[PDB]
Predict the structure.
Amino acid sequence: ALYPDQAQLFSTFDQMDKIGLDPQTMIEADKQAASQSREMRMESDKAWQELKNDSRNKDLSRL
Amino acid sequence: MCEPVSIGLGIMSVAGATMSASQQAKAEGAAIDAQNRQAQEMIKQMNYSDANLKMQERDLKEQQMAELTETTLNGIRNQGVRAAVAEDTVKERAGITESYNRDYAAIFGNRIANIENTQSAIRGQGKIIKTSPLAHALNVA
Amino acid sequence: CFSPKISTPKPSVQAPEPAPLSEEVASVDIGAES
Amino acid sequence: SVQAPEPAPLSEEVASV
Amino acid sequence: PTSLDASARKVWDSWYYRTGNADAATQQTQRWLNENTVTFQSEGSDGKSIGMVSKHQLMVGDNP
């Protein structure tokens, strides 16, 4: 809530403490993700509003 | 892997102290002798005053000079103060036996004041009163 | 598999000093002439 | 360990009964 | 500052070319920008910034 511009590094921390992965085998998935640059649409400003209003997702309506 | 001293340290590290004292003594003393000779050789070629030297030479000398420092027996060296102020076979000493052990008979019967570890304790006008660095530092400031 | 041994470090004297300051506010000019 | 050696003393003071 | 638009674009372009992320190139620019400049803040409880200058319009002598 204080630094909302570094949410990637917090995910990196979280995956090492809760899920259980090791520091390696993520410096190798990120490298191979680069070649297939995804950017496969649905990254916009109105795409979030639709995603937060589906009846299927009820943990995201109350936020 | 063939220097006489570069194998000595390795064999001391591996074998340890399982041998007698003399071998460890020599193995440790070789490198000490080498270091002292090198440092003395470098120091000889230098100048004395620091106002006649370049920058690199000054830094080298100030870094490598400190290995000649000694701290424990300064007083015994410097006692030779007697000449500045004025102008023994253990038996004559009190509180010390012939085998360099304490003599309890005198110190318990005759009420001996102090023990003369070194000379200059006989009579004495040189004072030299023990002090503490922190008290002096507070006194000045 | 052996008995390792350590070496006693040589005592060194360099005079005590307090911790350095991060900002290090000092004189603004370098050079004897002014 | 061994923070600093102890300088050798010139002479030492004791007491008695 | 209007005097720093020219190089910020080039740093952004270089990072985007060198990697693939479009959101790791917006983050490395800000580190450079915030390490080259100085920010001032208001005296109220809220801390909205009210300025931004460069660290050579403020030097007084030859000390770095």
Observations:
- The two ends of chain C are 69 Å apart (CA to CA).
